Design an enzyme around this catalytic site. Structure first.
Site, PDB file in Angstrom:
ATOM      1  N   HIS B 131     -41.963  22.478 -25.760  1.00 26.93           N
ATOM      2  CA  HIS B 131     -42.810  21.508 -25.087  1.00 26.93           C
ATOM      3  C   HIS B 131     -42.547  21.660 -23.591  1.00 26.93           C
ATOM      4  CE1 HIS B 131     -44.207  17.604 -23.573  1.00 26.93           C
ATOM      5  NE2 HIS B 131     -44.928  17.512 -24.676  1.00 26.93           N
ATOM      6  N   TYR B 132     -43.518  21.276 -22.771  1.00 29.52           N
ATOM      7  CA  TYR B 132     -43.412  21.378 -21.316  1.00 29.52           C
ATOM      8  C   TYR B 132     -42.179  20.659 -20.770  1.00 29.52           C
ATOM      9  CZ  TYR B 132     -44.553  20.092 -16.425  1.00 29.52           C
ATOM     10  OH  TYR B 132     -44.517  19.865 -15.068  1.00 29.52           O
TER      11      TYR B 132
END
Ligand code: MG
Ligand code: MG
Ligand code: MN
Ligand code: MN
Ligand code: MN
Ligand code: MN
Lengths: 184, 184
Positions: B131-132
């Site tokens: 995930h970012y």
């Protein structure tokens, strides 16, 4: 002794707006900073700069960015800006030197790695001005979402995608977790 | 149903060792991953790879890195390695995809921005797999040092500069803060 706000215990908060997510190919279009003490008290807010970028670049932004940056009025401030990376950096630097010395404060904000990666590429002096470490409120956010969803859900953030506004939100968010998530 | 550990709530912890601090100039020489659930229970430890690099690169490291990586035995493991970035990435990728799906978990560890920048440049697929966002224990470390020094000081960590041992430290450090710094 004196009442000036300088101290090496002071925290430096910084936010950026970019044309995209790729530090190597995208540019910085806005910069803002805020100095707090260790107790999260705001001492002084730094200069907020729309950073001029050539229009050919600004029109190569995806929909999300052209939508958001037009909406927030940032894209217009950019076209009328006479401030480039170096000037913004220098002025910001002159401001931060008043409250804390070089390499003393960690980079403070939300999800600031992205910022660290743009600073490194476009503002090496300011980048070096920060300690190596980071104070990222997003980390507290994650832990609140996983371990105390009702706590996280009680502080809903609505980002205006403007640097000075976002920095103010980042501080308020940390203040919130300190009272409601931390053992103190 | 079944008792396999897969879940999109699972966390991915990852540590790297490099030849230096410059991602555009340095290389990854070690990688390791550990998967936990949200409760921090370790489900499975991932493959720990010494990553082969040519001597002409390793001999260009500063005193500090040549000292640490020789002493920790990583350097000899690197010379004798038959694994490059791509193979380590693929094998790591094949391991992770059994506990969590792509882009679900944040990058978890200590000061992982440096890791994100090497991953981004040298391991594009594995980098995209996270995930970012980041889950950084260092952030908790900072707040403890400022707001509760006695708590921070009760968990002194001595790093061996070996990826897998560092990952195990990052987890136990988070477990430590969850109990003594968090309002749970
Ligand atoms: Mg933003
Ligand atoms: Mg390390
Ligand atoms: Mn931001
Ligand atoms: Mn922002
Ligand atoms: Mn590390
Ligand atoms: Mn390490």
């Amino acid at each position: 002794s004196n009442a000036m706000d300088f101290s090496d215990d002071n925290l430096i908060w910084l936010d950026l707006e970019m044309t995209g997510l790729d530090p190597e190919r995208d540019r910085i279009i806005e910069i803002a900073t805020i100095v707090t003490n260790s107790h999260l008290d705001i001492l002084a807010e730094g200069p907020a700069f729309a950073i001029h970028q050539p229009d050919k670049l600004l029109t190569a932004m995806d929909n999300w960015n052209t939508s958001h940056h037009t909406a927030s009025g940032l894209l217009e401030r950019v076209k009328n800006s006479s401030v480039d990376e170096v000037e913004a950096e220098t002025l910001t630097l002159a401001f931060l030197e008043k409250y804390v010395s070089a390499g003393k404060s960690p980079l403070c904000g939300n999800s600031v790695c992205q910022d660290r990666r743009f600073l490194s590429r476009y503002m090496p002096r300011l980048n070096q001005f920060f300690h190596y470490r980071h104070l990222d409120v997003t980390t507290l956010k994650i832990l609140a979402q996983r371990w105390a969803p009702q706590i996280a859900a009680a502080h809903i953030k609505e980002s205006q995608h403007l640097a000075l506004q976002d920095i103010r939100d980042s501080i308020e968010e940390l203040r919130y977790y300190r009272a409601h998530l931390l053992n103190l």
